Design a protein around this ligand. Structure first.
Ligand SMILES: CCCCCCCCCCCCCCCCCC(=O)OC[C@H](COP(=O)([O-])OCC(O)COP(=O)([O-])OC[C@@H](COC(=O)CCCCCCCCCCCCCCCCC)OC(=O)CCCCCCCCCCCCCCCCC)OC(=O)CCCCCCCCCCCCCCCCC
Ligand code: BCL
Ligand code: BCL
Ligand code: BCL
Ligand code: BCL
Ligand SMILES: CC[C@H]1c2cc3[nH]c4c(c3C)C(=O)[C@H](C(=O)OC)c4c3nc(cc4[nH]c(cc(n2)[C@@H]1C)c(C(C)=O)c4C)[C@@H](C)[C@@H]3CCC(=O)OC/C=C(\C)CCC[C@H](C)CCC[C@H](C)CCCC(C)C
Ligand SMILES: CC[C@H]1c2cc3[nH]c4c(c3C)C(=O)[C@H](C(=O)OC)c4c3nc(cc4[nH]c(cc(n2)[C@@H]1C)c(C(C)=O)c4C)[C@@H](C)[C@@H]3CCC(=O)OC/C=C(\C)CCC[C@H](C)CCC[C@H](C)CCCC(C)C
Ligand SMILES: COC(C)(C)C/C=C/C(C)=C/C=C/C(C)=C/C=C/C(C)=C/C=C\C=C(C)\C=C\C=C(/C)CC/C=C(\C)CCC=C(C)C
Ligand SMILES: CCCCCCCCCCCC[N+](C)(C)[O-]
Ligand SMILES: CCCCCCCCCCCC[N+](C)(C)[O-]
Ligand SMILES: CCCCCCCCCCCC[N+](C)(C)[O-]
Ligand SMILES: [Cl-]
Ligand SMILES: [Fe+3]
Lengths: 281, 300, 240
């Protein structure tokens, strides 16, 4: 199961731990220690979800939902019946995500490339632990974390984001949505740019990177360039998730009231809080 | 180890007047300055920008739409700058009252000013759509940007044009304002019974997705910039080691593989699908389906 | 129901898309091989795509993909076990033969061209009014390896005329010859350029360019792979 050019790269070494022990592949997949650890925490995980049905109810995956321990349990332990399963599954999830990230690192070393890819993964894991750890621990109960269920984590969002009025008024939520919208915009153009040059009009020759910069300059008067649009891609994405964890850890800890009323500090500024007219006052 | 998120050294040469081909050149401006500030991240040359017939029509219409709303903001602010700066996020230009329906002649202070700004917005965006097409044609390139731009237009058009006509009223559209179009997005979900139960809303989020793919692709080319991976076309026409390692990191990590041109096929489609499914979800909401919780109760 | 047909009409369209996208990602690297090089039995569920053929600019022929995939170079590896999936130890010097981190691809031995047909990369001393506009100027600074010893000095910057950015450092060694260092592999400091990848004694092993005014796709890969491979194969000498 090798690519026609792949043999030269499958040299031993680069492992973080274990050495030449787990240095080997299974078909297209590289294993390493952390491929073993990932499959460990993974397989251990699915066992406990599948368990939560002997005691939870049906087998329909649209209905399985491992909810966290109740609020009365605090950060203390809980029986596996009601919440205890959640806590262990959360460990296997983290253990599988960290093992996945360290696995890519071993792969990066074998290839002699930069570590930029597992680093970008880290920001996703940060946002995950924000919701199932830091945001509750700081709150004092595991019942504040979202449950692991298909349509039941959407009900968590709809109930959590409405406890503070309309969530759109959370300011970091505002900034976080912006990057998500822009990064999506940035994908759209970058994907079209490369293709529009490598696949030009029928019968014409492959356009150069010059034809790409000339396009943007004609269209908006500036082109970020080939290396720029990639630096831009990494930032818009990591910043989107960044504020999407920031907007959560402030919500309910440093600010627990309606998010729309937070904006009153701007309206209630002394130099204009009393001039009549307009909407407010 | 050195990363590659900022440049250590900057070089600069004569202003790049760009490729020529069948471009008009008479509509290219004097080159702008070179900002060292941008040069650290990406490029530093500003301009030259091309402004044709359509380039002016859109830019004119766009200022016309922009100024129309702000005039209304000044009216609401009592022509007072303090009330303007304070209540800025709160002012709004709402569509005509539902009593008028699709009647194209409503009073200004009761929605007529809305349709004025919409006409400017309608001609500004479309004249810009045609601008993105002819800028590709003038260089003999694929029009893929104009085609993906249509997807954004699609959602935009459904939000404030097709759906209002299908529901028989202008009042179903979106008002122009910051805090106002946020509340519109809210109540829409509530009038139609939680858009979470909309299957197209779920897919549109899933493709939004783009943040995952654009995080990976950016990190991968930076990771292989040591082999000149940022030169993405010459690696298509002549695969280097930079494209081989990039393919094998994807192979060795998750399984299925990706070519240099192959990954951009994923890229453009991940984005265009965001607003593609999104427009379909809004189009059916209210016109065909009145409550997505009730629709989802029948599993379809 | 209308909305139910819209959501099903989509999942059909989506599955066709995944098929389309997953085939287009088979142009390079397929057909799959075994470790010995014979074609593999299972080649995945998806079939190879229709050949598309690129028109290369400036009269450089065509590229039809997918096409005859060959190394066009010798690989100095050997099996470490008796069954598939196992690493291959090098039978020589992995940096000279070019395997693993130090692998290079036998691309065209021609330089890349800008849209006007000129060389994309030229040294600054031959660059039409190109200069350092910001940051520290690495010309004249000594080059330090991963072993804290001085291997040479920078004598020029090879710039990217169209995209306007530094790409290589021309580093003069003791014997007077110059090598090129990838810019993303050197650390330009206030008083020296530090190369974490190589140590001082491997700068002579860097591939030399044939023409002093121009560098090649093939030559670019041989240099970057060499310097990048030194991250792994200069293990008995790397402190910082
Ligand atoms: C509503 C809003 C519509 C917006 C949609 C935008 C789609 C953008 C697609 C794109 O970038 O293609 C550019 C491509 C244009 O190419 P070009 O630059 O003119 O020249 C071609 C070159 O030779 C270079 O050619 P190339 O190789 O770049 O493109 C070749 C061709 C490009 O294919 C196309 O022409 C696009 C295919 C149609 C996409 C629209 C689908 C709409 C979704 C309907 C969902 C219904 C749900 C109910 O390849 C494909 O992408 C094949 C189609 C893949 C989908 C397979 C579906 C399988 C289902 C079977 C059952 O396609 C279009 O014309 C897009 C439409 C533009 C509208 C504006
Ligand atoms: C998509 C579904 C909703 C919607 C829901 C939201 C939500 C939710 C948020 C925004 C936010 C924003 N919206 Mg809105 N918004 C919609 C339709 C629009 C339309 C339009 C179609 O004409 C426009 C121009 C805007 C404009 C904007 C900006 C003021 C702001 C940041 C956008 C951004 O990142 O741009 C990228 C920048 C470019 C230059 C391009 N909205 C529809 C009605 N919008 C965010 C904000 O900060 O609000 C204060 C925010 O939190
Ligand atoms: C009624 C509901 C409320 C609301 C309440 C909330 C709530 C509640 C939350 C958000 C959050 C978010 N909201 Mg909000 N929000 C609403 C309206 C909106 C609208 C809109 C136009 O309507 C938009 C665009 C957004 C946008 C967003 C983002 C800023 C953010 C989610 C993305 C993110 O980074 O996740 C971060 C990504 C992750 C956590 C993923 C982590 C994945 C891990 C690392 C790996 C998992 C791998 C898995 C096991 C793989 C399986 C693979 C196997 C091979 C099968 N909101 C309304 C007003 N919003 C969330 C947030 O802030 O998150 C920080 C959040 O919790
Ligand atoms: C921060 C944002 C909110 C939130 C709000 C929403 C909203 C809003 C939506 C989803 C949607 C989805 N969410 Mg959620 N969700 C959150 C956290 C998670 C986490 C997690 C561990 O952090 C996971 C795995 C999921 C999983 C999912 C999928 C079922 C679905 C599509 C995701 C997608 O396209 O991702 C992008 C990634 C890819 C496209 C790559 C492929 C990944 C595949 C799809 C992952 C499948 C995971 C599978 C169900 C996990 C089973 C575990 C087994 C051990 C394998 N959510 C947080 C709390 N989620 C959408 C949906 O359709 O819901 C019904 C939707 O509308
Ligand atoms: C409380 C609010 C409701 C809700 C109600 C809605 C409504 C209502 C809408 C969305 C929409 C969206 N929602 Mg929702 N949604 C909720 C929960 C969520 C959550 C979450 C739980 O965190 C998330 C992540 C999302 C995510 C999203 C996006 C995927 C989607 C918009 C796609 C897009 O790119 O728009 C951004 C892109 C555009 C708006 C296209 C713009 C195109 C035009 C041409 C751009 C230019 C305009 C103008 C000329 C620019 C001027 C330029 C100047 C320089 C300034 N929703 C809850 C349940 N959501 C939309 C959708 O598609 O739903 C299916 C939608 O209509
Ligand atoms: C998946 C589709 C994504 C996308 C696609 C997309 N948008 C695009 C493009 C593409 C492919 C363009 O080619 C086009 C462009 O020119 O980009 C540089 C554009 C564009 N996307 C725009 C905005 C935009 N796109 C958005 C969304 C997205 N567009 C999606 C995420 C949003 C948000 C956040 O919803 C916004 C605000 C513009 C920058 C531009 C279209 C410009 C236009 O209509 O210009 C005419 C109007 C004026 C000149 C008025 C100027 C008024 C000023 C106040 C002065
Ligand atoms: C910058 C952050 C953005 C991003 C980036 C990103 N994601 C990444 C990477 C990067 C750079 C990778 O390199 C890595 C990868 O390999 O990608 C192919 C990854 C990845 N992003 C993934 C998914 C993903 N990314 C998401 C989002 C994003 N990814 C962000 C927007 C989401 C969303 C929207 O929530 C998801 C679901 C995976 C495809 C992959 C990491 C796969 C992984 O960690 O595998 C190890 C784990 C297993 C094989 C199985 C573990 C099983 C558990 C023990 C089960 C129980 C716990 C679990 C939480 C259950 C419940 C979920 C409920 C909703 C049901
Ligand atoms: C201070 O300086 C001044 C005042 C001079 C200038 C300042 C101006 C200001 C402050 C402007 C502020 C503008 C704001 C706040 C704009 C906000 C816009 C937002 C948030 C819009 C959101 C959504 C809009 C949508 C979805 C629009 C949809 C509509 C269309 C795509 C087309 C519209 C169609 C119309 C009108 C039909 C026309 C009909 C015919 C027959 C032509
Ligand atoms: C957000 C995009 C704008 C580009 C950001 C410009 C600030 C970067 C400054 C680089 C600092 C100089 N140095 C030597 C540390 O690289
Ligand atoms: C020279 C001052 C005028 C700048 C115009 C405003 C910026 C437009 C976008 C960049 C184009 C700059 N340019 C080349 C037109 O001068
Ligand atoms: C690329 C994978 C995209 C993620 C898929 C998201 C699934 C949600 C789809 C809505 C559910 C439709 N249906 C018929 C089950 O109701
Ligand atoms: Cl950051
Ligand atoms: Fe790219």
């Amino acid at each position: 199961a090798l690519l026609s050019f792949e043999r030269k790269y499958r040299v031993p070494g680069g492992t973080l731990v274990g050495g030449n022990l787990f240095d080997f592949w299974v078909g297209p997949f590289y294993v390493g220690f952390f491929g073993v650890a990932t499959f460990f925490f993974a397989a251990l995980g699915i066992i406990l979800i599948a368990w939560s049905a002997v005691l939870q109810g049906t087998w329909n995956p649209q209905l399985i939902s491992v909810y966290p321990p109740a609020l009365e349990y605090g950060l203390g332990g809980a029986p596996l019946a009601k919440g205890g399963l959640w806590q262990i599954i959360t460990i296997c999830a983290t253990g599988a995500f960290v093992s996945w990230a360290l696995r890519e690192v071993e792969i990066c070393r074998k290839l002699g490339i930069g570590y930029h890819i597992p680093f970008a993964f880290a920001f996703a894991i940060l946002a995950y632990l924000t919701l199932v750890l830091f945001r509750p621990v700081m709150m004092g109960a595991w019942g504040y974390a979202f449950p692991y269920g298909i349509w039941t984590h959407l009900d968590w969002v709809s109930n959590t984001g409405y406890t503070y009025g309309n969530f759109h008024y959370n300011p970091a939520h505002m900034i976080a949505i912006s990057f998500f919208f822009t990064n999506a915009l940035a994908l759209a153009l970058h994907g079209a740019l490369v293709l529009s040059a490598a696949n030009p009009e029928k019968g014409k020759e492959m356009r150069t990177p010059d034809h790409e910069d000339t396009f943007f300059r004609d269209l908006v008067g500036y082109s970020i360039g080939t290396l720029g649009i990639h630096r831009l891609g990494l930032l818009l994405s990591l910043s989107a998730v960044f504020f999407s964890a920031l907007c959560m850890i402030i919500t309910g800890t440093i600010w627990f009231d309606q998010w729309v009323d937070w904006w009153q500090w701007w309206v209630k500024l002394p130099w204009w809080a009393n001039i009549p007219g307009g909407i407010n006052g | 180890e050195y990363q590659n998120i900022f440049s250590q050294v900057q070089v600069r040469g004569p202003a790049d007047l760009g490729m020529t081909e069948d471009v008009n050149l008479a509509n290219r401006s004097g080159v702008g300055p070179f900002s060292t500030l941008l040069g650290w991240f990406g490029n530093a040359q500003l301009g030259p920008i091309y402004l044709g017939s359509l380039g002016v029509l859109s830019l004119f219409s766009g200022l016309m739409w922009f100024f129309t709303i702000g005039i209304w903001f000044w009216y609401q602010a009592g022509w007072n700058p303090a009330v303007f700066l304070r209540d800025l996020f709160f002012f709004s230009l709402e569509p005509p009252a539902p009593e008028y329906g699709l009647s194209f002649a409503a009073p200004l202070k009761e929605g007529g000013l809305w349709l004025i700004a919409s006409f400017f917005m309608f001609v500004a965006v479309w004249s810009w759509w045609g601008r993105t097409y002819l800028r590709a044609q003038a260089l003999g390139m694929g029009k893929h940007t104009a085609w993906a731009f249509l997807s954004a237009i699609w959602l935009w058009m459904v939000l404030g044009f097709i759906r209002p006509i299908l529901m028989g009223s202008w009042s179903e559209a979106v008002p122009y304002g910051i805090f106002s179009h946020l509340d519109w997005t809210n109540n829409f979900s509530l009038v139609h019974g939680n858009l979470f139960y909309n299957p197209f809303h779920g897919l549109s989020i899933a493709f939004l997705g783009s943040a995952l793919l654009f995080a990976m692709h950016g990190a991968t080319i930076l990771a292989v910039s040591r082999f000149g991976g940022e030169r993405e076309l010459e690696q298509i026409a002549d695969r280097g080691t930079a494209a081989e390692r990039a393919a094998l990191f994807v192979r060795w990590t998750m399984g299925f593989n990706a070519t240099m041109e192959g990954i951009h096929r994923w890229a453009i489609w991940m984005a265009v699908l965001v607003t593609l499914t999104g427009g379909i979800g809004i189009l059916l909401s209210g016109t065909v389906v009145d409550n997505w919780y009730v629709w989802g109760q029948n599993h379809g | 129901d209308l909305a139910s047909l819209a959501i099903y009409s989509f999942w059909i369209f989506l599955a066709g898309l995944i098929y389309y996208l997953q085939t287009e990602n088979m142009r390079e690297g397929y057909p799959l091989e075994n470790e010995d090089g014979t074609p593999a039995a299972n080649q995945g569920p998806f079939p190879l795509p229709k050949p598309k053929t690129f028109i290369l600019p400036h009269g450089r022929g065509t590229l039809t993909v997918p096409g005859p995939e060959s190394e066009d170079r010798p690989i100095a590896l050997a099996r470490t076990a008796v069954s598939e999936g196992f690493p291959h130890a090098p039978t020589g010097d992995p940096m000279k033969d070019g395997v693993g981190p130090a692998s290079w691809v036998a691309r065209r031995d021609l330089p890349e061209l800008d849209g006007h047909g000129h060389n994309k990369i030229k040294p600054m001393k031959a660059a039409a009014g190109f200069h350092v506009s910001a940051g520290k100027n690495p010309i004249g600074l000594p080059v330090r390896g991963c072993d804290l010893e001085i291997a040479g000095k920078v004598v020029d910057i090879w710039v990217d005329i169209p995209e306007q950015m530094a790409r290589f450092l021309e580093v003069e060694l003791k014997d007077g010859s110059t090598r090129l260092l990838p810019m993303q592999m050197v650390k330009v400091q206030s008083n020296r350029v530090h190369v974490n990848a190589l140590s001082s004694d491997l700068f002579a092993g860097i591939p030399t360019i044939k023409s002093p005014t121009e560098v090649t796709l093939l030559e670019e890969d041989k240099i970057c792979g060499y310097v990048a491979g030194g991250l792994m194969y200069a293990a008995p000498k790397r402190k910082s």
